[PDB]
Amino acid sequence: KNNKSWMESEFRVYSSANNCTFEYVSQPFLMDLEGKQGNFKNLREFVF
Amino acid sequence: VFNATRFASVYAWNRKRISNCVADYSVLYNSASFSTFKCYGVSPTKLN
């Protein structure tokens, strides 16, 4: 609506976590979640 | 950990898992900041 926001509101990824054996966090940044019109301007390819 | 505000009781001793980091043991063993220090099965120098 007004105050476009476009930021994480609800966390439904997982319900709970009890035992953690590893943890890593990157540096702060800001990523634009605003919707865009037209063709796909970004491509991300990952190999795991 | 060695200077934390509070420690768990002897019966309730906490089990802290340490991983995903580096250990600098030079400042710990060789600082002579503790009354007693001993190792079993391996010398402190080899552990470094």
CSV table of C-alpha atoms in Angstrom, one decimal:
chain,number,residue,atom,x,y,z
A,1,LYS,CA,0.0,0.0,0.0
A,2,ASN,CA,1.6,3.2,1.3
A,3,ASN,CA,5.0,2.7,2.9
A,4,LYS,CA,5.9,0.0,0.3
A,5,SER,CA,8.0,-1.8,3.0
A,6,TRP,CA,9.0,-4.9,1.0
A,7,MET,CA,10.8,-6.5,4.0
A,8,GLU,CA,10.6,-9.8,5.8
A,9,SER,CA,7.4,-9.9,8.0
A,10,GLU,CA,6.7,-13.5,9.0
A,11,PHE,CA,9.1,-16.4,9.6
A,12,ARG,CA,7.7,-19.7,8.5
A,13,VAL,CA,11.0,-21.4,7.4
A,14,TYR,CA,11.1,-23.7,10.5
A,15,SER,CA,9.2,-24.1,13.7
A,16,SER,CA,12.0,-24.6,16.2
A,17,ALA,CA,15.7,-25.5,16.6
A,18,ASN,CA,17.3,-27.1,19.7
A,19,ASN,CA,20.9,-28.2,19.0
A,20,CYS,CA,23.2,-26.2,16.8
A,21,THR,CA,26.6,-27.5,15.8
A,22,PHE,CA,27.5,-24.7,13.3
A,23,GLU,CA,26.8,-21.1,12.8
A,24,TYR,CA,27.9,-18.4,10.3
A,25,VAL,CA,26.7,-14.9,9.5
A,26,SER,CA,27.7,-12.4,6.8
A,27,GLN,CA,28.1,-8.7,7.0
A,28,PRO,CA,25.1,-6.3,7.1
A,29,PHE,CA,23.6,-5.1,3.7
A,30,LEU,CA,20.4,-4.2,2.1
A,31,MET,CA,18.7,-6.1,-0.8
A,32,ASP,CA,15.9,-4.6,-2.9
A,33,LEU,CA,12.8,-6.9,-2.7
A,34,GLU,CA,10.6,-4.4,-4.7
A,35,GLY,CA,8.8,-6.1,-7.6
A,36,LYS,CA,9.8,-5.2,-11.1
A,37,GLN,CA,8.1,-5.3,-14.5
A,38,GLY,CA,9.4,-6.7,-17.8
A,39,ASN,CA,12.0,-9.4,-18.5
A,40,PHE,CA,14.2,-11.2,-15.9
A,41,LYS,CA,17.2,-8.9,-15.3
A,42,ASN,CA,19.1,-11.2,-12.9
A,43,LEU,CA,20.5,-14.7,-13.1
A,44,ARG,CA,21.9,-16.7,-10.2
A,45,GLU,CA,23.6,-20.1,-10.6
A,46,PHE,CA,24.8,-22.2,-7.7
A,47,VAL,CA,26.6,-25.5,-7.4
A,48,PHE,CA,26.5,-27.4,-4.1
B,1,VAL,CA,34.5,-18.5,29.1
B,2,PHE,CA,37.2,-18.4,31.7
B,3,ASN,CA,36.1,-14.9,32.9
B,4,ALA,CA,32.3,-15.3,32.5
B,5,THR,CA,30.2,-13.6,35.1
B,6,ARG,CA,28.7,-16.9,36.4
B,7,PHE,CA,29.6,-20.6,36.2
B,8,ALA,CA,27.3,-23.7,36.4
B,9,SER,CA,27.3,-25.9,39.4
B,10,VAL,CA,29.5,-28.9,39.7
B,11,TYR,CA,26.6,-31.3,39.2
B,12,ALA,CA,25.0,-29.0,36.6
B,13,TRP,CA,28.4,-28.4,34.7
B,14,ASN,CA,27.7,-27.0,31.3
B,15,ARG,CA,29.0,-28.8,28.2
B,16,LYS,CA,30.2,-26.2,25.7
B,17,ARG,CA,30.9,-27.3,22.1
B,18,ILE,CA,33.5,-25.2,20.3
B,19,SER,CA,34.0,-25.3,16.6
B,20,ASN,CA,34.2,-23.2,13.4
B,21,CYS,CA,37.0,-20.9,14.8
B,22,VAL,CA,40.7,-20.8,15.6
B,23,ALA,CA,42.3,-21.3,19.0
B,24,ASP,CA,45.4,-19.2,20.1
B,25,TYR,CA,46.7,-21.2,23.1
B,26,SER,CA,49.9,-19.1,23.5
B,27,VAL,CA,48.1,-16.5,25.6
B,28,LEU,CA,46.4,-19.2,27.7
B,29,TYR,CA,49.1,-21.7,28.7
B,30,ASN,CA,52.1,-19.4,28.7
B,31,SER,CA,50.6,-16.4,30.5
B,32,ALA,CA,51.0,-17.9,34.0
B,33,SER,CA,47.7,-16.3,35.0
B,34,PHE,CA,46.4,-19.4,36.7
B,35,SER,CA,47.4,-21.2,39.9
B,36,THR,CA,47.7,-24.7,38.6
B,37,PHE,CA,47.8,-26.2,35.1
B,38,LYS,CA,48.3,-29.9,34.0
B,39,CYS,CA,47.6,-32.0,31.0
B,40,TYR,CA,47.1,-35.8,30.6
B,41,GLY,CA,48.2,-37.9,27.7
B,42,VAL,CA,49.9,-35.0,25.9
B,43,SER,CA,52.2,-32.1,26.8
B,44,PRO,CA,50.9,-28.5,26.5
B,45,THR,CA,53.6,-27.6,24.0
B,46,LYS,CA,52.5,-30.4,21.6
B,47,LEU,CA,48.8,-29.4,21.8
B,48,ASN,CA,49.8,-26.1,20.2
